[PDB]
Design a protein around this ligand. Structure first.
Ligand SMILES: COC1=C(OC)C(=O)C(C/C=C(\C)CC/C=C(\C)CC/C=C(\C)CC/C=C(\C)CC/C=C(\C)CC/C=C(\C)CC/C=C(\C)CC/C=C(\C)CC/C=C(\C)CCC=C(C)C)=C(C)C1=O
Ligand SMILES: Cc1cc2nc3c(=O)[nH]c(=O)nc-3n(C[C@H](O)[C@H](O)[C@H](O)COP(=O)(O)OP(=O)(O)OC[C@H]3O[C@@H](n4cnc5c(N)ncnc54)[C@H](O)[C@@H]3O)c2cc1C
Ligand code: HEC
Ligand code: HEC
Ligand code: HEC
Ligand code: F3S
Lengths: 413, 136, 539
């Protein structure tokens, strides 16, 4: 592939500008659940009428790195232009060439983004950009480190923008560079700590495990779900092995950001040798549409034990992950576990599709209430994952709603 | 704790398998005691027979107790441990599924239905020999 | 109190739920009524797991689903007497049904089959049975629509000589065989029989947001993971789009005006409280058994013999696929249990010139795991110690179950009159079926038994046990037959009753021929055709 095509893949610029698996390529129309509402990706195909076909190199660079549209309107920071700001001029030119000459134009307008006041006006984004310290010089290599470290830093920060989800935001929804890659809540999902912290972060991960997780999303202790599954299946699985190795090299040098109340790594939680009782289920026969099944062990056995075995160790071939020693169950924050139960896992790598069925209200296999999901998650945490973590029905409801509402979103009421 | 320990030891001797679930054993003992009020006495008598005659395995005990009145109780214990039920009707209580001993001789090949074997296409592989008893 | 809607569908089975989903997708207001309750898949799984192993060895497909007294369904291990069967072949109509949101598709094997083009013109081709009101070409688009909606996998690149022609490939390709299916295919190929993959509404890959089939081998009576299709999926999708579902709604009466159009229907709740429902169009999608029962029970003064019974054909021409069961211990290991419970079947005798004389048949191999059967049989043998384990392993490795299903012609004396001796908690009479297999099926079985004997001998089977009677298969067709003449049929080619232009019967009772394979996919295709007719009528 061309250099511009590779840069577009690495930057994952198509995962958001394509509405979905059955959406037009780079045509926009994909809804991004921002804290203040839904922001829609715009048409990117070089359509001179409905896309960015009339963009010059300077206008395209401005839109990509400074969040300024062709007309001068400020782009919403759902655009990771705060990450693309430090892209090199050559990379921007290659991306522009790929967009103009290698993407077929699509003549179809995208839905307009309508945000509530005071976020309706895209002119206050100027001093928001000023307060976010977005501006910065184009990336240059740090001669103190080797080329692998520099390339990995470029991939992590500028292209793949891992900090967009893994670095927490401050009150003004700007990146908090003090807690670099320390973990963040990005809605219904939480991006965990991926610093070099041995217990809080991914410091205890083996290099092979980290490489395999980044390349495929599947590892004996961690599986990619939600936004990370999309990132892997749209960008990371197509990166060369050298790029993933460079990313791992840079990640191993990220300063550690410890979490409060952490003693062992997220994948180092042993499983309790406990389970449910078959005898206790006899009273629940002739009791269709389970409502009297309030036992967490019984609910887990009825709903989840088929794939993840009753001991929680999954299948022998590893297709069904072991809930014991799993980073999602072993997290002190049970956000990812609740999200996995609610929405399932769907990751397509190498044209082969993982699928966990969803178990939320909209489930086809087995809808579960907030109390049932909370009970199942509590059982999983106490027996297979972090015993110090707890789940309530209110937490499940909050995850369903799209996570905790940010304080800044209260202004639009 | 004496009754449950004796029942578990007799069950380990009778089924020929040491690894037996303690909770399943307790439930089976409670159900047996509810059904038969002198079950503890029969368990004790079977244990005295085993110790006095020094039966190495359940084969010898079964062969030497074909007409003894304690044979039905031993066969009932074996059936309860293997099938997971004690009665023989449709509303009989099930005390062990996926842990009942009759699913174990074929666990390495045959699926216990509502619990998955390893992966959504595992069956493309050749099965093991019938002459190799897996485990347990 | 009036419960108004554009279309009301009586019965939230696969047919009713698929029709409701198609209707709400096109902007119609739909009221979905079901006599049974809502059911949770995981609770049914837990009920099956705690069902006694003897009820797993012998295929009990009803105990995991509790029977509600107001709308009872058939159970046969206690053998409740909801469905009374008479006639020389009463055992061949002891059919299992499940009542609830989802219907009998809750516990089916999901063998989604397309009928052959000759199955729609059986009478015109062989001079036996009845012709369908529509041809295969007319139902082909609806066949494909149903296959895409339910996610049917099949042998995409493969030449099966007696197979329905396809304009499009299957949505999924058939998953690979287990050991038992491969061994059976080789054996019967040496025997001269063509063992071909069964098209199944099963996920050979993640489909419709549901997991790939992991070979739980429990398709009847419940999938723990939802890797196969259930009509509850269509019910859920319709409800999400605006369809109103009322469980425990036992419809018992229908009202007709001077033009014989249905103006309203009434249903009982579990406390026998009557609720009136008014709609622009009425659909009964209950069963091949429950639809004729409702039609006969709701007889008016304008319709003394039952609703849409001007031809005296409601409840007549009851059809199914009479089966002959076979069990034996194969000389060589078969290891049943790899994949779904029904992975392949012998489709060689689905068609031929012999169909003018005796019935075309389908021979199949049961892929249900034999561990429960082997364990119970070995425990019944009074074995002990290592001999017990060896016997269990040998019997689960060598246990084979073989069947042969036949095609029964529509006979007017195969009836579903209302029973005068039994009722339920709501006072509604129990259904009563008099079933005769007929000389057609008897002549077919005289050869099917020899074929099964040959299969057992080729496998070196011992302890051979053939059923001396005919077994049911729960493909309840006929009862409200379709055709062109109003004097000789109940509904037309659009599944609309001749008597009432307002009533549609989206059920398998409309099918004029039972065919040779499972008939629920044809039922779904006919329901989608009726959906098209309803949409044309109301717009
Ligand atoms: C006119 O008044 C006002 C101003 O100016 C005087 C202001 O500046 C502000 C300050 C605030 C803003 C201008 C809002 C700016 C931000 C947005 C409109 C949206 C911001 C969105 C994000 C940063 C989302 C980041 C989240 C990510 C990357 C999650 C991961 C993404 C996916 C999974 C996809 C306020 C309150 C104000 O009232
Ligand atoms: C064990 C088994 C295995 C099967 N395997 C296969 C297979 O492999 N392939 C295949 O094609 N078919 C198979 N079938 C057949 C299949 O289940 C049926 O053909 C299918 O369910 C079609 O049923 P239906 O939609 O007409 O109605 P159903 O789903 O049977 O019932 C619909 C609903 O009507 C409701 N109802 C009934 N009377 C009333 C009333 N008076 N008022 C209100 N609601 C009412 C019921 O409560 C029910 O929920 C199998 C059946 C069984 C029992
Ligand atoms: C029912 C009550 C449950 C609970 C509590 C969980 N699951 Fe599953 N799951 C399955 C597969 C294949 C995956 C990973 C995707 C892949 O590898 O392709 C998962 C994922 C999870 C996780 C997260 C693991 C991670 O590292 O992110 C958790 C916490 C989890 N599950 C718990 C498979 C299945 C099923 C297959 C038929 C069923 C049913 C379930 N899962 C249900 C549950
Ligand atoms: C959101 C827009 C993300 C982008 C871009 C990246 N990641 Fe991510 N990651 C994200 C989430 C929501 C999750 C967890 C999903 C869950 O099940 O809760 C993850 C997961 C990881 C992990 C595993 C850590 C763990 O599970 O404990 C690692 C090591 C990781 N992510 C690293 C990573 C890198 C190196 C990225 C770009 C170069 C990257 N992620 C992008 C959210 C998002
Ligand atoms: C990887 C290469 C990449 C290129 C090149 C790119 N984008 Fe965007 N982009 C947006 C959103 C949302 C807007 C509009 C926001 C606004 O108006 O402030 C936008 C706006 C633009 C615009 C302005 C044109 C217009 O009509 O608004 C251009 C040009 C653009 N993007 C190009 C979400 C994304 C996301 C989301 C995950 C990714 C990744 C992303 N974009 C990656 C890329
Ligand atoms: S039970 Fe389900 S997992 Fe497959 S074998 Fe049947 S569809």
């Amino acid at each position: 592939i061309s250099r511009g095509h590779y840069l577009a893949i690495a930057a994952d610029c198509a995962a958001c500008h394509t509405n979905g698996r059955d959406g037009q390529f780079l045509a926009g129309g994909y809804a991004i659940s921002s804290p203040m509402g839904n922001i829609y990706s715009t048409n990117i195909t070089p359509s001179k009428t409905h896309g960015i076909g009339n963009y010059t190199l300077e206008q395209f660079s401005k839109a990509l790195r400074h969040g300024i549209r062709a007309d001068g309107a400020q782009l919403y920071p759902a655009m990771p232009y705060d990450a693309y700001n430090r892209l090199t001029d050559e990379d921007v030119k290659s991306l522009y060439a790929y967009i103009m000459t290698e993407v077929k134009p699509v003549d179809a307008p995208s839905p307009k983004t309508q945000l509530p006041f005071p976020f309706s006006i895209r002119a206050s984004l100027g001093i928001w950009k000023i307060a976010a310290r977005i501006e910065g010089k184009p990336y240059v290599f740090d001669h103190t480190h080797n080329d692998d470290w520099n390339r990995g830093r470029y991939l992590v920060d500028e292209l793949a923008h891992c900090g967009e989800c893994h670095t927490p935001r401050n009150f003004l929804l700007a990146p908090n560079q003090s807690a670099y890659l320390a973990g963040a809540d990005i809605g219904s999902w939480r991006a965990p700590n991926i610093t070099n912290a041995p217990q809080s972060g991914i410091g205890s991960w083996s290099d092979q495990d980290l490489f395999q997780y980044l390349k495929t999303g599947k590892t004996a202790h961690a599986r990619a779900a939600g936004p990370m599954a999309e990132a892997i299946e749209h960008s990371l699985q197509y990166l060369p092995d050298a790029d993933i190795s460079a990313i791992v090299t840079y990640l191993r040098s990220v300063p550690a950001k410890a979490e409060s109340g952490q003693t062992v790594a997220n994948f180092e939680h042993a499983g309790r040798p406990s389970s449910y009782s078959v005898a206790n289920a006899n009273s629940r026969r002739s009791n269709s549409t389970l409502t009297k099944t309030t036992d967490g062990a019984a609910l887990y056995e009825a709903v989840c034990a088929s794939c993840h075995q009753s001991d929680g160790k999954g299948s022998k071939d590893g297709y069904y992950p072991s809930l014991v020693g799993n980073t999602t169950t072993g997290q002190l924050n049970p956000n990812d576990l609740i999200a996995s139960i609610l929405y399932g896992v769907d990751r397509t790598t190498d044209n082969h599709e993982i699928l966990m069925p969803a178990f939320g209200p909209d489930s086809l296999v087995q809808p579960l209430t907030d109390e049932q999901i909370a009970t199942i998650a509590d059982y999983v945490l106490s027996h297979f994952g972090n015993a110090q973590a707890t789940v309530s029905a209110d937490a499940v409801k909050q995850v369903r709603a799209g996570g905790k509402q940010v304080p800044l979103a209260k202004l639009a009421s | 704790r004496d009754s449950i320990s004796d029942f578990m030891q007799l069950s380990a001797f009778a089924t020929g398998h040491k690894n037996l679930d303690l909770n399943i054993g307790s439930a089976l003992l409670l159900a047996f005691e509810a059904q038969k009020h002198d079950f503890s006495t029969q368990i004790k008598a079977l244990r005295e027979h085993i110790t006095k005659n020094n039966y190495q395995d359940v084969e010898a005990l079964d062969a030497a107790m074909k007409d003894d009145p304690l044979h039905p109780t031993l066969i009932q214990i074996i059936r309860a441990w293997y099938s997971g039920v004690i009665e023989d009707e449709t509303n009989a209580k099930v005390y062990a599924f996926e842990k009942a001993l009759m699913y174990q001789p074929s666990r390495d090949v045959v699926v216990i239905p509502t619990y998955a074997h390893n992966g959504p296409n595992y069956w493309v592989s050749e099965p093991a020999s019938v002459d190799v008893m897996p485990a347990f | 109190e009036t419960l108004s809607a554009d279309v009301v569908i009586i019965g939230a089975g696969i047919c009713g739920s698929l029709l409701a989903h198609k209707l709400v997708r096109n902007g119609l207001s739909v009221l979905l009524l079901d006599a049974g309750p809502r059911r949770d898949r995981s609770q049914i799984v837990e009920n099956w797991r705690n069902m006694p192993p003897d009820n797993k060895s012998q295929y009990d497909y009803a105990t995991p689903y509790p029977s509600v007294p107001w709308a009872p369904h058939t159970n046969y291990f206690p053998d409740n007497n909801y469905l009374i069967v008479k006639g020389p072949d009463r055992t061949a109509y002891k059919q299992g049904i499940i009542k609830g949101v989802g219907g009998t598709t809750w516990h089916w094997a999901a063998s989604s089959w397309r009928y052959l083009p000759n199955d729609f013109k059986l009478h015109s081709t062989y001079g036996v049975g009845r012709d369908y009101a529509m041809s295969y070409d007319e139902l082909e688009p609806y066949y494909y629509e149903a296959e895409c909606e339910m996610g049917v996998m099949g042998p995409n690149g493969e030449e099966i000589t007696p197979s329905a022609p396809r304009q499009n490939p299957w949505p999924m390709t058939s998953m690979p065989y287990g050991y038992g299916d491969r061994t059976f295919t080789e054996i019967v190929s040496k025997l001269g029989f063509s063992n071909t993959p069964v098209p199944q509404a099963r996920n050979s890959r993640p489909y419709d947001g549901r997991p790939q089939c992991c070979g739980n081998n429990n398709c009847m009576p419940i999938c723990p993971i939802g890797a196969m299709y259930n009509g509850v999926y269509a019910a859920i999708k319709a409800e999400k789009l605006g369809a109103k579902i009322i469980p425990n709604a036992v419809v018992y009466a229908m009202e007709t005006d001077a033009k014989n159009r249905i103006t309203a229907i009434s249903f009982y709740d579990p406390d026998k409280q009557s609720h009136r429902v008014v709609a622009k169009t009425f659909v009964i999608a209950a069963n091949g058994i429950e639809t004729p029962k409702l039609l006969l029970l709701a007889a008016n003064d304008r319709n003394p013999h039952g609703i849409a019974n001007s031809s005296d054909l409601v409840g007549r021409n009851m059809m199914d696929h009479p089966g002959i069961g076979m069990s034996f211990q194969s000389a060589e290991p078969i290891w049943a249990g790899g994949g779904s419970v029904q992975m392949s079947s012998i489709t060689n005798f689905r068609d031929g010139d012999f169909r003018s004389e005796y019935a075309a048949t389908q021979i199949g191999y049961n892929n249900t795991a034999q561990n429960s059967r082997a364990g119970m049989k070995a425990l019944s043998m009074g074995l002990v110690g290592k001999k017990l384990d060896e016997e269990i392993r040998r019997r689960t490795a060598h246990g084979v179950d073989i069947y042969a299903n036949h095609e029964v012609l529509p006979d007017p004396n195969n009836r579903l009159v209302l029973s005068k001796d039994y009722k339920d908690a709501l006072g509604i009479p129990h259904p009563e079926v008099t079933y005769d297999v007929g000389e057609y099926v008897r002549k077919s079985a005289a050869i099917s038994r020899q074929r099964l004997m040959d299969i057992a001998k080729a496998m070196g089977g011992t302890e051979i046990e053939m059923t001396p009677y005919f077994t049911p298969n729960a493909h309840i067709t006929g009862g409200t037959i379709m055709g062109h003449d109003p004097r000789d049929s109940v509904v037309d080619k659009w599944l609309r009753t001749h008597d009432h232009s307002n009533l549609f019967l989206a059920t398998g009772a409309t099918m004029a021929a039972s065919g040779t394979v499972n008939s629920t996919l044809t039922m779904a295709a006919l329901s989608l055709r009726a959906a098209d007719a309803i949409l044309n009528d109301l717009k």
